[PDB]
Amino acid sequence: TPQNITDLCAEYHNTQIHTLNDKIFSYTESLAGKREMAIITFKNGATFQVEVPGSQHIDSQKKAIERMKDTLRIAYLTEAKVEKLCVWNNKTPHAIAAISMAN
Amino acid sequence: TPQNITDLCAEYHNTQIHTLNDKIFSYTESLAGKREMAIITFKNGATFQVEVPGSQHIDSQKKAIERMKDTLRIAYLTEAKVEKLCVWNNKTPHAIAAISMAN
Amino acid sequence: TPQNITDLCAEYHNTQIHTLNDKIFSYTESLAGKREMAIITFKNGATFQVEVPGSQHIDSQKKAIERMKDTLRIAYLTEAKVEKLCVWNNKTPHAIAAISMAN
Amino acid sequence: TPQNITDLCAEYHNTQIHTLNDKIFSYTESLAGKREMAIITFKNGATFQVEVPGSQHIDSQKKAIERMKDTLRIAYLTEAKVEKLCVWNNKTPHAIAAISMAN
Amino acid sequence: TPQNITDLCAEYHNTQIHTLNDKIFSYTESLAGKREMAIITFKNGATFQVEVPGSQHIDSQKKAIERMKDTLRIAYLTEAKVEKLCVWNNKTPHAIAAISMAN
């Protein structure tokens, strides 16, 4: 049972940690069919997605995907510093699995 | 898989990008029957809706329509700069498909 | 396809626009049985309700009623100026159908 | 249909109004089984609960119970003044039925 | 019903109170499958989780688990002082059962 985002990230294949220590520079969200997703960027250009829910996801992830888009939106609006993202690197943009925020 | 709102918008027929770079001027929302919708305007007069859920929508868009109304309200209340809207232009007001926020 | 709250309000019988251009003075909400409602007031004495969900409402309005109470709470707490309310004036207090906020 | 919290409260047995005219001093929330509740206090020593959902609640109260806990949390965090609480006084701590915020 | 977090915590086996009297240092959440959880830390090094929902949880705890992650996120972003945590100590990190916020 993970103590931190790095240990959590290590439990999965196709993942990596991005260390940002920066606020989110842009927040995009779509309701368009088959693109019901969010995209964030940081000021250096690095871009990340919350994937459209699909068959790669188990049912328990569905609530967590909605929570993650809520978290990214409020992090963006509050200018909260993102410490790290755990992402799947077999997608473009890389797909967010987890986020850590620290000051 | 789109990197940004402009590329996302270009995946759909009957769409266009509006570049606002401005906060929302007014936020309206209704619970009246068959008009369960939100309307926003900008200082330049541009007006946009989040459509009432209807037969044009697929199931996966339902939660996303609700999220979009949540996003517009908090964006309005925080005076968040809206960068771009991707809209369907076969409706009046033009119907929001996606939003980007950045400074 | 109304472009504003006034035109939206005119699509319905037994409604009127109240122009407040003021923040909410008080916010009240209840979980008591058969009084699951919100009440707001303005400094000029005007009092409005979000009605308890009932048989007068169609199913699509249910989520919108919940959203309206969310909107009123956060408007109150942020001291956001309410521009107009569309209300049914065949209820006492007048029952909120729509709200517009503008600076 | 009541115009204020006091009139609403008077529609029920085993209730009373507490006047606080103060912000919440502490907010406590639990996910422990059979104690999925919230407790608030004020600096005068007064303590109130939002009861665990139970047999005494009708279906329409369920969403409103959840809303009330949302309300108390955000009230606490924004330091919003609570005017009055309508409570059931046949429970210890007294159980919140309604809240008004003003001033 | 208990009047405070300490009395509530005492109703359960394998629990203890931690007194923090400090804001949350870091907030982490994950949507990865089977690790749909949150982790928080404090500057003293203390680490706590909100557990993945599982068969150890009764139906009524599922909504409360979601609420708790909402609470920790907003507490973190607002820099709200956490007074105490009631936790289960038969998990690592210790698993949050309840939270109190004061000062």
Side-chain angles (χ1 to χ4, degrees):
Chain A
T1 324
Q3 295 281 321
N4 63 49
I5 189 165
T6 296
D7 295 351
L8 188 153
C9 209
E11 294 187 311
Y12 297 88
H13 290 261
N14 295 128
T15 59
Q16 75 191 64
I17 291 284
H18 288 61
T19 304
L20 283 317
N21 292 315
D22 199 12
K23 65 181 184 22
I24 298 166
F25 177 79
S26 76
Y27 173 86
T28 295
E29 92 180 26
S30 163
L31 60 82
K34 317 282 192 197
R35 294 291 194 210
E36 308 90 347
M37 70 187 293
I39 305 164
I40 60 170
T41 74
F42 296 84
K43 77 170 142 126
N44 40 69
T47 303
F48 305 94
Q49 64 175 307
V50 181
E51 288 185 279
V52 180
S55 49
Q56 70 271 212
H57 291 145
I58 62 175
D59 196 64
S60 57
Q61 295 180 275
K62 301 302 184 62
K63 56 177 187 15
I65 289 167
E66 298 310 293
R67 178 179 302 284
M68 187 60 75
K69 293 173 289 192
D70 298 338
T71 294
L72 298 178
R73 175 181 61 210
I74 192 65
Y76 173 76
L77 296 169
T78 59
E79 298 183 65
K81 182 183 302 187
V82 178
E83 186 206 31
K84 297 175 184 277
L85 293 170
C86 173
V87 303
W88 285 284
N89 56 27
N90 64 331
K91 297 289 166 68
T92 295
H94 294 346
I96 295 168
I99 187 175
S100 62
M101 295 182 288
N103 35 110
Chain B
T1 314
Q3 294 277 336
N4 58 63
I5 191 174
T6 297
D7 294 348
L8 191 149
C9 212
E11 295 185 338
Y12 293 88
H13 294 142
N14 298 128
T15 60
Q16 81 188 242
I17 289 284
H18 293 280
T19 301
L20 294 137
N21 290 310
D22 197 11
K23 68 182 174 103
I24 299 165
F25 183 74
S26 71
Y27 175 85
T28 298
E29 96 181 18
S30 167
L31 60 79
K34 315 290 196 201
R35 290 294 195 211
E36 306 89 350
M37 71 184 300
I39 304 162
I40 61 171
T41 71
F42 293 83
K43 191 135 198 216
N44 75 344
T47 297
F48 303 96
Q49 67 170 308
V50 179
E51 287 184 277
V52 180
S55 59
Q56 71 268 40
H57 292 129
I58 65 183
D59 197 15
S60 53
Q61 293 177 283
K62 300 313 193 30
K63 278 186 178 31
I65 287 162
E66 299 307 298
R67 177 181 295 288
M68 184 60 70
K69 291 176 288 195
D70 294 344
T71 293
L72 296 180
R73 176 181 56 210
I74 196 57
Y76 172 71
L77 290 172
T78 57
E79 305 182 58
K81 188 172 294 188
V82 177
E83 185 213 20
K84 291 159 187 300
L85 293 169
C86 170
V87 309
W88 285 286
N89 59 18
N90 64 330
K91 300 288 166 64
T92 296
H94 291 174
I96 294 165
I99 184 169
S100 62
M101 295 186 290
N103 287 171
Chain C
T1 36
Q3 310 241 192
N4 58 66
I5 193 169
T6 294
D7 294 347
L8 190 152
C9 208
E11 296 178 328
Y12 295 86
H13 283 133
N14 307 129
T15 57
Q16 79 170 92
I17 287 287
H18 281 43
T19 300
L20 284 316
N21 288 321
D22 198 12
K23 68 184 180 182
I24 298 166
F25 181 81
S26 74
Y27 176 89
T28 296
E29 80 178 31
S30 163
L31 54 81
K34 285 157 192 335
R35 291 294 191 210
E36 306 90 347
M37 73 185 296
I39 307 170
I40 62 169
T41 72
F42 292 84
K43 184 188 357 111
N44 67 354
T47 298
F48 304 96
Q49 67 169 309
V50 181
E51 287 186 276
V52 179
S55 68
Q56 70 273 41
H57 300 127
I58 63 176
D59 209 82
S60 54
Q61 296 180 271
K62 290 184 183 140
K63 276 180 166 176
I65 290 161
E66 298 311 296
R67 177 180 298 284
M68 184 65 71
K69 295 176 286 195
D70 292 347
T71 294
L72 298 176
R73 178 177 61 211
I74 192 68
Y76 171 72
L77 291 170
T78 60
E79 302 181 53
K81 187 182 292 192
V82 175
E83 181 203 40
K84 293 160 185 287
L85 292 166
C86 172
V87 302
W88 288 281
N89 61 5
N90 70 341
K91 295 287 168 54
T92 291
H94 280 10
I96 297 167
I99 182 171
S100 63
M101 295 182 284
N103 58 43
Chain D
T1 312
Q3 307 247 356
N4 57 63
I5 189 166
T6 293
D7 292 351
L8 189 155
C9 203
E11 297 186 323
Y12 295 88
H13 294 144
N14 305 124
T15 59
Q16 71 201 238
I17 289 286
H18 284 36
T19 301
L20 283 307
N21 284 315
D22 198 11
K23 68 182 179 204
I24 298 164
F25 178 86
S26 71
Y27 175 89
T28 298
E29 144 174 332
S30 165
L31 57 76
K34 313 298 185 177
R35 295 289 193 205
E36 308 90 344
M37 67 189 295
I39 300 164
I40 59 167
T41 69
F42 292 86
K43 76 178 165 177
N44 68 3
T47 301
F48 303 100
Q49 66 170 310
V50 176
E51 285 185 279
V52 174
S55 292
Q56 72 267 42
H57 298 108
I58 62 175
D59 208 60
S60 56
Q61 289 179 278
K62 304 297 177 87
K63 275 198 261 211
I65 291 170
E66 299 310 295
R67 174 182 299 286
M68 183 65 72
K69 291 172 288 193
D70 294 348
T71 293
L72 297 179
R73 178 179 55 211
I74 194 61
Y76 171 73
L77 293 167
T78 59
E79 297 184 83
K81 198 160 170 226
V82 177
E83 185 206 27
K84 295 165 185 282
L85 291 173
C86 173
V87 304
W88 284 285
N89 56 24
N90 61 348
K91 294 293 163 58
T92 299
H94 282 0
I96 295 167
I99 185 170
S100 64
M101 295 186 283
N103 309 118
Chain E
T1 316
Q3 306 231 13
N4 60 59
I5 191 167
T6 296
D7 293 344
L8 190 155
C9 203
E11 299 182 340
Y12 295 86
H13 299 130
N14 303 125
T15 58
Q16 67 199 64
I17 291 288
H18 298 322
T19 300
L20 286 306
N21 284 317
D22 197 12
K23 69 181 183 164
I24 297 174
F25 179 79
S26 76
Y27 177 85
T28 298
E29 75 178 38
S30 160
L31 60 76
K34 311 296 207 213
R35 290 293 195 205
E36 309 90 346
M37 73 183 289
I39 306 167
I40 63 173
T41 73
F42 292 87
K43 186 79 158 276
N44 61 10
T47 299
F48 302 101
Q49 64 171 308
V50 177
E51 292 184 85
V52 181
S55 56
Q56 69 265 221
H57 295 133
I58 61 176
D59 292 316
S60 53
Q61 294 179 274
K62 289 159 188 308
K63 271 186 136 62
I65 287 166
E66 298 306 297
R67 178 182 293 286
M68 181 64 73
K69 291 169 292 190
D70 298 341
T71 294
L72 295 179
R73 177 182 59 212
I74 192 62
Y76 171 74
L77 295 170
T78 60
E79 302 182 43
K81 186 180 125 191
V82 177
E83 187 203 31
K84 293 166 185 283
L85 293 171
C86 173
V87 308
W88 288 282
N89 58 30
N90 67 337
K91 303 283 159 68
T92 299
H94 290 349
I96 295 166
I99 187 171
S100 66
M101 288 187 291
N103 311 295

